Amino acid sequence: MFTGSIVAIVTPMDEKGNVCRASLKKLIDYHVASGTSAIVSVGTTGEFATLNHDEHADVVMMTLDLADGRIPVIAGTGANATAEAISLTQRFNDSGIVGCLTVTPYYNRPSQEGLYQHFKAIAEHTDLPQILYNVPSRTGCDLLPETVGRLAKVKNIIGIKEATGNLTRVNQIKELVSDDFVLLSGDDASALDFMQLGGHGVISVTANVAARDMAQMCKLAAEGHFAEARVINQRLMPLHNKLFVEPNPIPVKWACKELGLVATDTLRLPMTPITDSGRETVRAALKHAGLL
Template sequence: MFTGSIVALVTPMDVKGNVDRVSLKKLVEYHIASGTSAIVSVGTTGESATLDHKEHIDVIKQTVEYAAGRINVIAGTGANATAEAILLTKQVEKLGVVGCLTVTPYYNKPTQEGLYQHFKVIAENTSLPQILYNVPGRTGCDLKPETVAKLAKISNIVALKDATSDLARVYKTRKLVGDDFKLLSGDDVTFFEFMLLGGDGIISVSANVAAREMARICQLITAKRIKEARKINDTLDLLHNKLFIEPNPIPVKWACEKIGLIQNSTMRLPMTPLTNSSIPEVEKALKLAKLL
């Protein structure tokens, strides 16, 4: 369930900044057709920071309805207050999601004990499988491998999304958590190496526009057909980089519009459109990946 290419789905919006349901349905169909393993709805790439609670839950609900059991949906339910994360988790329990992606508390900068207690209490308040999400570059705190190992002993904490880009952690964390606990890359640039070192897949930004390619790479690595996988990934290498030329999800929403997956790349403030100087860079990457 938590392996392969999982897309960190963008949340499409119309020119007024309202959620674009037509484009959302189109995106879900695109990922079903492309072999994506699962969808993360309303994670960082889905602009969770600028959706209110009602919209947050509604986007997840709509995504599950459009999926109609044909692809698994994982709900982004992270918050920097434990009580808020529990509230979001409780609200998605009956929507049909297969699990939750819960980011480390941002801004607060809790200790390792604080992080342990945060995730432990969330897990104790739900039966849904939980994916820990560590992205220090955004949150200001770092979930250490030793803390992950403690959390992995809790039955419904089943996976880690690691967006540190620190490949040395893959082996260290795997040794601590064992083989059943899933390790997912959260960094497209290094995900290929992450999987070669024992990772189980990726929660991907690039998969928003290169869904078929990302799914195939993961399948080939799992089948030990590394040369074939590398050949595909080499065509995506520039894309992996240029989709982060400005803060995510600015470039990837522009790219989704450019290749016709969404109607426009509207975002809510404080996120602003892709700058003119970056447009040729992202366009070049799309062309190299044969997506344009």
């Protein structure tokens, strides 16, 4: 499933920074009960940067085992070297994931033609649906609508997570792709706007702690009930902003701990513990959302 509220799920850790199976179970149960459409496993919010390929595959496989067929799982699979992306994708072929979320190469700043060759090569070598991921503020490069148009002609490139926050991208892309290509926001604060312009859903950080409200917001949006959706969005807006008051996923992991969804808020370096001022901002946002 590639529409609606999709959670960019945390990778909960114990105090030593190893994956906490019990906490992950609790989250997956929460998303199944709360109507989340799908789970993105080991994306950005899942600390893809700091897990190696083996830990990464283990978390995706644990997620699939715990989901037990009840919710679809999408794996984070991007890399900044095309061979590495291909490699990582092969590990998931026939795993039971429904698709991959693959970020533009970071740090090396490829050209548009380089992005086109990168994602074309990845798609060629799997039968899994690929969702492109554009987030220039993190990567240093910006996959432009013209190149998305080119890539959308590849049979298994099926959509994009557009995290620029630049809402003009929705209809720039839409006009260049077919009606079945999925447009997903990657920017929780602008996501409702993104859906109102023609987007199909959101791959969300806020959904980690407000799963039911996110799922209902996205359904109302899909039905065209934007005024109703916006009431929900206004209650969630402080979270949409304050989950980034310190680097993601520092705030959202602390929030999940505060709600009791995970045992510890531990992260791996270079992520560091939430500051006291951040705890206060985040808990105020949680209370605005009605969650505490």
